[PDB]
Short mmCIF file of all heavy atoms in Angstrom, two decimals:
data_model
loop_
_atom_site.label_atom_id
_atom_site.label_comp_id
_atom_site.label_asym_id
_atom_site.label_seq_id
_atom_site.Cartn_x
_atom_site.Cartn_y
_atom_site.Cartn_z
N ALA A 67 133.43 66.66 73.89
CA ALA A 67 132.11 66.17 73.95
C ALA A 67 131.14 67.27 74.43
O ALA A 67 131.57 68.27 74.88
CB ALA A 67 131.99 64.99 74.94
N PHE A 68 129.89 67.03 74.26
CA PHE A 68 128.83 67.96 74.70
C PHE A 68 128.81 68.09 76.18
O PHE A 68 128.52 69.10 76.70
CB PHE A 68 127.43 67.48 74.21
CG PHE A 68 126.35 68.38 74.52
CD1 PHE A 68 126.09 69.50 73.77
CD2 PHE A 68 125.53 68.13 75.62
CE1 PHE A 68 125.07 70.33 74.09
CE2 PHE A 68 124.46 68.94 75.93
CZ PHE A 68 124.25 70.08 75.16
N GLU A 69 129.15 66.95 76.85
CA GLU A 69 129.14 66.98 78.38
C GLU A 69 130.20 67.88 78.95
O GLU A 69 130.05 68.52 79.94
CB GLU A 69 129.20 65.58 78.93
CG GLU A 69 128.78 65.50 80.36
CD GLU A 69 127.32 65.71 80.56
OE1 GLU A 69 126.50 65.46 79.67
OE2 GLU A 69 127.01 66.31 81.64
N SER A 70 131.40 67.84 78.32
CA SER A 70 132.45 68.84 78.77
C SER A 70 132.07 70.26 78.38
O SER A 70 132.49 71.16 79.19
CB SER A 70 133.73 68.42 78.10
OG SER A 70 134.19 67.13 78.55
N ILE A 71 131.34 70.41 77.35
CA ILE A 71 130.81 71.79 76.99
C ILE A 71 129.94 72.27 78.10
O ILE A 71 130.02 73.47 78.50
CB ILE A 71 130.13 71.80 75.63
CG1 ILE A 71 131.12 71.52 74.51
CG2 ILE A 71 129.43 73.12 75.36
CD1 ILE A 71 132.29 72.39 74.57
N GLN A 72 129.11 71.35 78.67
CA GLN A 72 128.29 71.74 79.81
C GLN A 72 129.09 72.15 80.97
O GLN A 72 128.80 73.05 81.66
CB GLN A 72 127.30 70.59 80.13
CG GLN A 72 126.15 70.57 79.24
CD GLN A 72 124.91 70.04 79.93
OE1 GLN A 72 124.84 70.05 81.13
NE2 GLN A 72 123.94 69.61 79.15
N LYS A 73 130.21 71.49 81.22
CA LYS A 73 131.03 71.75 82.41
C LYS A 73 131.73 73.12 82.23
O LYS A 73 131.80 73.94 83.16
CB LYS A 73 132.13 70.69 82.55
CG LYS A 73 133.08 70.93 83.61
CD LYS A 73 134.56 71.21 83.10
CE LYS A 73 135.19 69.93 82.42
NZ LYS A 73 136.51 70.25 81.95
N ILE A 74 132.20 73.45 81.01
CA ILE A 74 132.81 74.72 80.80
C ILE A 74 131.86 75.87 80.87
O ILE A 74 132.13 76.95 81.36
CB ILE A 74 133.55 74.66 79.38
CG1 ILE A 74 134.65 73.62 79.36
CG2 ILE A 74 134.25 76.04 79.09
CD1 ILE A 74 134.82 73.06 78.01
N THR A 75 130.58 75.67 80.34
CA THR A 75 129.59 76.74 80.46
C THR A 75 129.15 76.88 81.87
O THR A 75 128.89 78.05 82.32
CB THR A 75 128.37 76.42 79.57
OG1 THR A 75 127.94 75.11 79.94
CG2 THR A 75 128.77 76.43 78.17
N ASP A 76 129.15 75.87 82.72
CA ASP A 76 128.81 76.06 84.10
C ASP A 76 129.94 76.73 84.84
O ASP A 76 129.70 77.67 85.62
CB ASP A 76 128.57 74.76 84.75
CG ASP A 76 127.23 74.07 84.29
OD1 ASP A 76 126.78 74.58 83.21
OD2 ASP A 76 126.74 73.12 84.91
N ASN A 77 131.23 76.46 84.46
CA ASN A 77 132.34 77.18 85.14
C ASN A 77 132.42 78.63 84.71
O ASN A 77 132.80 79.48 85.48
CB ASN A 77 133.64 76.49 84.77
CG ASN A 77 133.68 75.10 85.29
OD1 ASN A 77 133.13 74.77 86.31
ND2 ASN A 77 134.47 74.28 84.64
N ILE A 78 131.91 78.99 83.52
CA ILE A 78 131.80 80.38 83.13
C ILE A 78 130.64 81.08 83.87
O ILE A 78 130.88 82.05 84.58
CB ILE A 78 131.55 80.58 81.61
CG1 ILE A 78 132.92 80.07 80.87
CG2 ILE A 78 131.28 81.92 81.26
CD1 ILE A 78 132.80 80.23 79.38
N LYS A 79 129.47 80.54 83.72
CA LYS A 79 128.28 81.29 84.16
C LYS A 79 128.08 81.23 85.64
O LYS A 79 127.21 81.96 86.18
CB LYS A 79 127.06 80.81 83.40
CG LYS A 79 126.42 79.55 83.96
CD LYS A 79 125.50 78.91 83.05
CE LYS A 79 124.21 79.64 82.95
NZ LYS A 79 123.12 78.64 82.54
N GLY A 80 128.76 80.36 86.37
CA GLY A 80 128.42 80.07 87.75
C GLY A 80 128.88 81.14 88.78
O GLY A 80 128.02 81.77 89.44
N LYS A 81 130.13 81.36 88.88
CA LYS A 81 130.67 82.12 89.99
C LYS A 81 130.53 83.60 89.69
O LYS A 81 130.20 84.41 90.59
CB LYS A 81 132.12 81.73 90.24
CG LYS A 81 132.30 80.62 91.20
CD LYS A 81 133.67 80.69 91.91
CE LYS A 81 134.10 79.43 92.62
NZ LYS A 81 135.55 79.27 92.77
N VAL A 82 130.72 84.01 88.46
CA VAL A 82 130.71 85.44 88.01
C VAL A 82 129.87 85.53 86.74
O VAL A 82 130.15 84.78 85.79
CB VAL A 82 132.12 85.98 87.91
CG1 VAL A 82 132.06 87.24 87.05
CG2 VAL A 82 132.62 86.31 89.30
N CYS A 83 128.90 86.46 86.72
CA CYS A 83 127.93 86.45 85.65
C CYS A 83 128.40 87.28 84.46
O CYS A 83 127.93 87.05 83.31
CB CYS A 83 126.56 86.89 86.13
SG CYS A 83 125.85 85.76 87.29
N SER A 84 129.31 88.18 84.71
CA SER A 84 129.87 89.09 83.63
C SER A 84 130.60 88.30 82.60
O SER A 84 130.70 88.74 81.43
CB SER A 84 130.76 90.12 84.22
OG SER A 84 131.50 90.77 83.20
N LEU A 85 131.21 87.16 82.99
CA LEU A 85 131.86 86.34 82.04
C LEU A 85 130.94 85.78 80.92
O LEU A 85 131.26 85.71 79.75
CB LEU A 85 132.59 85.15 82.69
CG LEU A 85 133.48 85.44 83.87
CD1 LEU A 85 134.34 84.10 84.05
CD2 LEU A 85 134.39 86.57 83.68
N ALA A 86 129.69 85.45 81.34
CA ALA A 86 128.65 85.03 80.42
C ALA A 86 128.29 86.18 79.40
O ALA A 86 128.12 85.89 78.28
CB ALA A 86 127.43 84.53 81.18
N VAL A 87 128.32 87.34 79.91
CA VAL A 87 127.96 88.50 79.05
C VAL A 87 129.04 88.74 78.03
O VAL A 87 128.73 88.95 76.85
CB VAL A 87 127.63 89.69 79.87
CG1 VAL A 87 127.86 90.99 79.18
CG2 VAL A 87 126.22 89.64 80.39
N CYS A 88 130.32 88.68 78.42
CA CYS A 88 131.39 88.86 77.54
C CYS A 88 131.50 87.79 76.45
O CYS A 88 131.61 88.00 75.31
CB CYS A 88 132.74 88.94 78.21
SG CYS A 88 132.87 90.41 79.23
N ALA A 89 131.26 86.52 76.89
CA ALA A 89 131.19 85.39 75.96
C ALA A 89 130.05 85.48 75.00
O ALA A 89 130.25 85.21 73.83
CB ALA A 89 131.20 84.00 76.76
N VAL A 90 128.90 85.90 75.53
CA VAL A 90 127.73 85.98 74.63
C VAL A 90 127.87 87.09 73.65
O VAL A 90 127.41 87.01 72.48
CB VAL A 90 126.46 86.09 75.52
CG1 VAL A 90 125.32 86.61 74.73
CG2 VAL A 90 126.14 84.73 75.97
N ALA A 91 128.56 88.16 74.01
CA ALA A 91 128.85 89.24 73.05
C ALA A 91 129.69 88.79 71.90
O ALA A 91 129.35 89.03 70.73
CB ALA A 91 129.50 90.40 73.77
N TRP A 92 130.76 88.08 72.24
CA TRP A 92 131.58 87.49 71.15
C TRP A 92 130.81 86.49 70.31
O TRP A 92 131.00 86.40 69.10
CB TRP A 92 132.88 86.96 71.63
CG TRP A 92 133.73 86.52 70.46
CD1 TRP A 92 134.62 87.34 69.83
CD2 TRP A 92 133.79 85.24 69.83
NE1 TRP A 92 135.23 86.66 68.77
CE2 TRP A 92 134.75 85.35 68.82
CE3 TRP A 92 133.13 84.08 69.98
CZ2 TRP A 92 135.04 84.27 67.95
CZ3 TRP A 92 133.42 82.98 69.25
CH2 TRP A 92 134.37 83.12 68.18
N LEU A 93 129.96 85.67 70.97
CA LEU A 93 129.19 84.66 70.27
C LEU A 93 128.23 85.28 69.31
O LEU A 93 128.00 84.76 68.23
CB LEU A 93 128.47 83.77 71.25
CG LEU A 93 129.32 82.73 71.95
CD1 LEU A 93 128.46 81.94 72.84
CD2 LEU A 93 130.03 81.88 70.99
N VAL A 94 127.62 86.44 69.73
CA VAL A 94 126.62 87.12 68.91
C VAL A 94 127.36 87.66 67.69
O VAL A 94 126.83 87.55 66.51
CB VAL A 94 125.90 88.18 69.61
CG1 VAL A 94 125.30 89.16 68.76
CG2 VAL A 94 124.85 87.50 70.45
N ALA A 95 128.53 88.28 67.83
CA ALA A 95 129.31 88.72 66.60
C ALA A 95 129.65 87.58 65.71
O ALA A 95 129.44 87.63 64.47
CB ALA A 95 130.55 89.45 67.13
N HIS A 96 130.08 86.48 66.29
CA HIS A 96 130.55 85.38 65.53
C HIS A 96 129.43 84.63 64.74
O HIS A 96 129.56 84.15 63.64
CB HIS A 96 131.34 84.35 66.39
CG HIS A 96 131.72 83.09 65.73
ND1 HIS A 96 130.95 81.98 65.71
CD2 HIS A 96 132.85 82.81 65.06
CE1 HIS A 96 131.57 81.06 65.12
NE2 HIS A 96 132.70 81.48 64.68
N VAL A 97 128.23 84.64 65.43
CA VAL A 97 127.10 83.96 64.74
C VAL A 97 126.54 84.85 63.65
O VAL A 97 126.06 84.38 62.61
CB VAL A 97 126.01 83.56 65.74
CG1 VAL A 97 124.79 82.99 65.17
CG2 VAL A 97 126.53 82.47 66.59
N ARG A 98 126.59 86.16 63.84
CA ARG A 98 126.18 87.10 62.90
C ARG A 98 127.06 86.98 61.58
O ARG A 98 126.44 87.14 60.43
CB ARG A 98 126.24 88.54 63.36
CG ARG A 98 125.57 89.51 62.50
CD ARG A 98 124.08 89.61 62.87
NE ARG A 98 123.38 90.64 62.10
CZ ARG A 98 123.38 91.85 62.37
NH1 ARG A 98 124.05 92.37 63.44
NH2 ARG A 98 122.73 92.71 61.59
N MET A 99 128.32 86.69 61.73
CA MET A 99 129.11 86.53 60.44
C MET A 99 128.85 85.27 59.75
O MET A 99 129.13 85.15 58.59
CB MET A 99 130.58 86.69 60.78
CG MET A 99 130.90 88.07 61.14
SD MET A 99 131.10 89.02 59.65
CE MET A 99 132.83 88.73 59.45
N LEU A 100 128.37 84.28 60.42
CA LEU A 100 128.39 82.91 59.80
C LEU A 100 127.27 82.74 58.78
O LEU A 100 126.41 83.54 58.63
CB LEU A 100 128.24 81.86 60.86
CG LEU A 100 129.40 81.54 61.75
CD1 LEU A 100 129.12 80.22 62.40
CD2 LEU A 100 130.67 81.43 60.89
N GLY A 101 127.31 81.60 58.05
CA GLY A 101 126.27 81.27 57.18
C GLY A 101 125.11 80.67 57.85
O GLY A 101 125.02 80.65 59.04
N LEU A 102 124.20 80.13 57.07
CA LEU A 102 122.98 79.62 57.70
C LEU A 102 123.19 78.20 58.28
O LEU A 102 122.89 77.99 59.47
CB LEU A 102 121.94 79.53 56.63
CG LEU A 102 120.59 78.78 57.14
CD1 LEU A 102 119.91 79.62 58.19
CD2 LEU A 102 119.71 78.47 56.01
N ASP A 103 123.87 77.31 57.59
CA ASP A 103 123.97 75.93 58.02
C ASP A 103 125.10 75.81 59.04
O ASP A 103 125.12 74.81 59.81
CB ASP A 103 124.23 75.05 56.85
CG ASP A 103 123.09 75.12 55.82
OD1 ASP A 103 122.16 76.00 55.98
OD2 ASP A 103 123.07 74.33 54.88
N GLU A 104 125.98 76.82 59.16
CA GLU A 104 127.16 76.70 59.99
C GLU A 104 126.87 77.16 61.40
O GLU A 104 127.74 77.17 62.27
CB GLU A 104 128.29 77.50 59.37
CG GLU A 104 128.61 77.03 57.97
CD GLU A 104 129.27 78.07 57.14
OE1 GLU A 104 129.30 79.25 57.55
OE2 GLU A 104 129.73 77.74 56.02
N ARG A 105 125.66 77.58 61.68
CA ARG A 105 125.39 78.28 62.92
C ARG A 105 125.02 77.37 64.02
O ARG A 105 125.30 77.68 65.23
CB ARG A 105 124.23 79.28 62.72
CG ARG A 105 124.72 80.65 62.36
CD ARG A 105 123.58 81.41 61.83
NE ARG A 105 124.01 82.73 61.45
CZ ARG A 105 123.24 83.77 61.19
NH1 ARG A 105 121.92 83.60 61.22
NH2 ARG A 105 123.71 84.94 60.84
N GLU A 106 124.49 76.21 63.75
CA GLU A 106 123.72 75.40 64.58
C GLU A 106 124.43 75.03 65.92
O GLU A 106 123.80 74.96 67.00
CB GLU A 106 123.40 74.02 63.88
CG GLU A 106 122.53 74.32 62.65
CD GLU A 106 122.31 73.07 61.84
OE1 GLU A 106 122.90 71.99 62.12
OE2 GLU A 106 121.49 73.14 60.88
N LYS A 107 125.74 74.80 65.92
CA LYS A 107 126.47 74.55 67.11
C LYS A 107 126.56 75.74 68.01
O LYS A 107 126.29 75.57 69.23
CB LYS A 107 127.84 73.98 66.78
CG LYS A 107 127.85 72.71 65.92
CD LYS A 107 127.90 71.44 66.75
CE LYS A 107 127.82 70.21 65.93
NZ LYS A 107 128.30 69.00 66.54
N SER A 108 126.89 76.87 67.47
CA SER A 108 127.28 78.00 68.30
C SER A 108 126.15 78.53 69.07
O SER A 108 126.24 79.06 70.20
CB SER A 108 127.95 79.11 67.49
OG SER A 108 128.09 80.22 68.27
N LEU A 109 124.92 78.49 68.46
CA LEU A 109 123.72 78.87 69.14
C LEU A 109 123.50 78.07 70.45
O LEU A 109 123.00 78.60 71.43
CB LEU A 109 122.52 78.71 68.22
CG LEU A 109 122.45 79.66 66.98
CD1 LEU A 109 121.51 79.17 66.03
CD2 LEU A 109 122.11 81.07 67.46
N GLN A 110 123.84 76.75 70.46
CA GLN A 110 123.78 75.94 71.61
C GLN A 110 124.60 76.54 72.78
O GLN A 110 124.18 76.43 73.91
CB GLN A 110 124.12 74.49 71.37
CG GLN A 110 123.05 73.60 70.98
CD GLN A 110 122.64 73.79 69.58
OE1 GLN A 110 121.52 74.22 69.23
NE2 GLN A 110 123.54 73.41 68.68
#
């Protein structure tokens, strides 16, 4: 669910901030490869 996604993102970004940077780096690579309509979830 979206609400568990919020829990996982809080557990990433909360205690240590570098984890958010590593995740966002992979997310940027992965969104750059995708098509136009397939992107909508990952940007969230």
Side-chain angles (χ1 to χ4, degrees):
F68 182 81
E69 194 69 32
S70 297
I71 292 309
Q72 281 212 17
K73 177 250 287 179
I74 300 152
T75 53
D76 291 14
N77 297 330
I78 291 182
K79 81 197 281 207
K81 272 205 194 155
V82 162
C83 294
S84 166
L85 307 197
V87 157
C88 292
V90 162
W92 186 88
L93 283 183
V94 159
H96 174 269
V97 175
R98 193 87 179 278
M99 288 279 271
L100 286 194
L102 172 70
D103 301 7
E104 302 154 351
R105 266 165 181 193
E106 298 175 354
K107 300 266 176 164
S108 174
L109 294 164
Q110 269 78 244

